[PDB]
């Protein structure tokens, strides 16, 4: 499957793509404002994620640091990134279908649209100014808006027992972005697409 990753932000981002225990394609790349990077993701990829990283520095070996979404200091991510990270999430070729969503469960750093480029389903978007409107207690000094689990580490926010409800914090993310997961047990906003669809992830789709 092809994913075209497009940076429409006015600032550089470092795109990342991983399934948690391995890179997808090269795993990461710099995208200047306006740049597009097309990656190939193996069919059957379960639990894949794409995200943006901001304010990164890498040396000639591709080691460094990002202020949001850092994946063990690598340019080419092999693991998931450090919150806050808006997440494009996907599982491909799962019994004949693809499943896509956007999640704020690990916080929000950059607005995103995640849409198919092929027929048969709709896209999802979280493009509101969540960082600007972020509650004081969730603001990440390094940049972005943390999820409550990251900040407070309670069973209720982290849904450790599989028994949790919405919270004042989850409701903030849900109010700004109804079409993204706001907590672990949120009413699913997952979209079912034909198996083997192709996609575009756009950072800053409205600006």
Coordinates of C-alpha atoms in Angstrom, one line a residue, residues 47-207:
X47 CA -1.2 -1.5 14.2
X48 CA 0.8 0.8 12.0
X49 CA 1.1 4.5 12.8
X50 CA 2.2 7.6 11.0
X51 CA 3.0 10.9 12.9
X52 CA 4.8 14.2 12.6
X53 CA 7.8 15.2 14.8
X54 CA 8.7 18.8 15.4
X55 CA 11.8 20.8 16.2
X56 CA 14.3 18.0 15.4
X57 CA 18.0 17.9 15.2
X58 CA 19.9 15.0 13.7
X59 CA 23.6 14.5 13.1
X60 CA 25.1 12.9 9.9
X61 CA 24.4 9.4 11.3
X62 CA 20.8 10.2 11.8
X63 CA 20.9 10.4 15.6
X64 CA 19.5 13.3 17.5
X65 CA 16.4 14.6 19.3
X66 CA 12.9 16.0 18.5
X67 CA 10.7 18.1 20.8
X68 CA 7.6 16.1 19.9
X69 CA 7.3 12.5 18.7
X70 CA 10.9 11.5 19.3
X71 CA 11.5 7.8 18.6
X72 CA 14.6 6.9 20.6
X73 CA 16.5 9.7 18.9
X74 CA 16.5 8.2 15.4
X75 CA 15.7 10.0 12.1
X76 CA 14.5 6.6 10.8
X77 CA 12.0 5.5 13.4
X78 CA 11.8 1.8 14.4
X79 CA 9.6 2.4 17.5
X80 CA 6.6 4.6 18.4
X81 CA 7.2 8.3 19.3
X82 CA 7.2 10.2 22.6
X83 CA 3.9 12.0 23.2
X84 CA 2.4 14.4 22.4
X85 CA 1.7 13.0 19.0
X86 CA -1.4 13.2 16.8
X87 CA -1.6 9.7 15.3
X88 CA -2.7 8.3 12.0
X89 CA -3.5 4.7 12.8
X90 CA -4.1 1.8 10.4
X91 CA -4.4 -1.9 10.1
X92 CA -4.4 -3.3 6.5
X93 CA -5.8 -6.4 4.9
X94 CA -7.6 -7.5 8.1
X95 CA -10.0 -10.2 6.8
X96 CA -10.4 -8.4 3.5
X97 CA -10.7 -4.8 4.7
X98 CA -8.5 -1.9 5.8
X99 CA -9.2 0.1 9.0
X100 CA -8.1 3.7 9.6
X101 CA -8.5 6.3 12.3
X102 CA -6.9 9.3 13.9
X103 CA -6.2 9.2 17.6
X104 CA -5.5 11.8 20.3
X105 CA -5.0 9.1 23.0
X106 CA -1.3 10.0 22.9
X107 CA -2.0 13.7 22.7
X108 CA -1.8 16.2 19.8
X109 CA 1.1 18.0 18.2
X110 CA 0.2 18.7 14.6
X111 CA -3.2 18.8 12.8
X112 CA -3.8 16.0 10.3
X113 CA -6.1 14.6 7.6
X114 CA -5.9 10.9 6.8
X115 CA -7.8 10.0 3.7
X116 CA -7.9 7.2 1.1
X117 CA -6.7 8.1 -2.4
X118 CA -8.7 5.2 -3.8
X119 CA -12.4 4.5 -3.9
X120 CA -14.8 3.1 -1.3
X121 CA -14.5 5.1 1.9
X122 CA -14.2 8.5 3.6
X123 CA -11.3 10.1 5.3
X124 CA -10.9 11.4 8.8
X125 CA -9.5 14.7 10.1
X126 CA -8.4 16.4 13.2
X127 CA -7.4 19.9 12.2
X128 CA -8.6 22.2 15.0
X129 CA -6.1 24.3 17.0
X130 CA -5.7 21.9 19.9
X131 CA -2.3 23.2 20.9
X132 CA -3.6 26.8 21.1
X133 CA -6.7 25.8 23.1
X134 CA -5.0 23.2 25.2
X135 CA -5.9 23.2 28.9
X136 CA -3.1 24.6 31.1
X137 CA -2.4 21.3 32.9
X138 CA -2.0 19.4 29.6
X139 CA 0.3 21.9 27.9
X140 CA 3.6 20.3 27.0
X141 CA 6.5 22.7 27.7
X142 CA 8.4 21.0 24.9
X143 CA 5.5 21.7 22.5
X144 CA 2.0 20.2 21.9
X145 CA -0.9 19.1 24.1
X146 CA -0.4 16.0 26.3
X147 CA -3.1 13.4 26.9
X148 CA -4.1 13.1 30.5
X149 CA -2.6 9.6 30.9
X150 CA 0.8 10.9 30.0
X151 CA 0.5 13.8 32.5
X152 CA -1.2 12.0 35.5
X153 CA -0.6 8.3 35.1
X154 CA -3.9 7.1 36.7
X155 CA -5.9 4.0 36.0
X156 CA -8.8 6.2 34.9
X157 CA -6.9 8.1 32.2
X158 CA -4.8 5.2 31.1
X159 CA -7.8 2.8 31.1
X160 CA -5.5 0.2 32.7
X161 CA -8.3 -2.1 33.9
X162 CA -10.4 -1.8 30.7
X163 CA -12.9 0.1 32.8
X164 CA -12.7 3.8 32.2
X165 CA -15.1 6.6 31.2
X166 CA -14.7 10.0 29.5
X167 CA -13.1 12.7 31.5
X168 CA -12.9 16.5 31.5
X169 CA -9.6 16.1 29.6
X170 CA -10.8 13.6 27.1
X171 CA -13.9 15.7 26.4
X172 CA -11.6 18.6 25.5
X173 CA -10.0 16.6 22.7
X174 CA -13.4 15.2 21.6
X175 CA -14.9 18.7 21.5
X176 CA -12.1 20.1 19.3
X177 CA -11.9 16.9 17.2
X178 CA -15.1 14.8 17.2
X179 CA -13.6 12.4 14.5
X180 CA -10.6 11.3 16.5
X181 CA -10.3 8.9 19.5
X182 CA -10.1 10.9 22.7
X183 CA -9.6 8.1 25.2
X184 CA -9.1 4.3 25.0
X185 CA -12.8 3.4 25.2
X186 CA -14.1 6.2 23.1
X187 CA -17.0 5.3 20.8
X188 CA -14.9 4.2 17.7
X189 CA -14.4 6.6 14.8
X190 CA -12.6 4.0 12.8
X191 CA -13.4 3.9 9.1
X192 CA -13.6 0.7 7.1
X193 CA -11.9 0.8 3.7
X194 CA -11.6 -1.8 1.0
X195 CA -8.6 -4.1 1.5
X196 CA -5.5 -2.8 -0.2
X197 CA -6.6 0.9 -0.4
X198 CA -4.0 3.6 -0.7
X199 CA -3.8 6.7 1.4
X200 CA -2.6 10.3 2.0
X201 CA -1.7 11.7 5.3
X202 CA -1.6 15.5 5.2
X203 CA -0.2 17.6 8.1
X204 CA -1.9 21.0 8.5
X205 CA -4.6 20.3 6.0
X206 CA -6.4 23.6 6.5
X207 CA -3.3 25.8 6.9

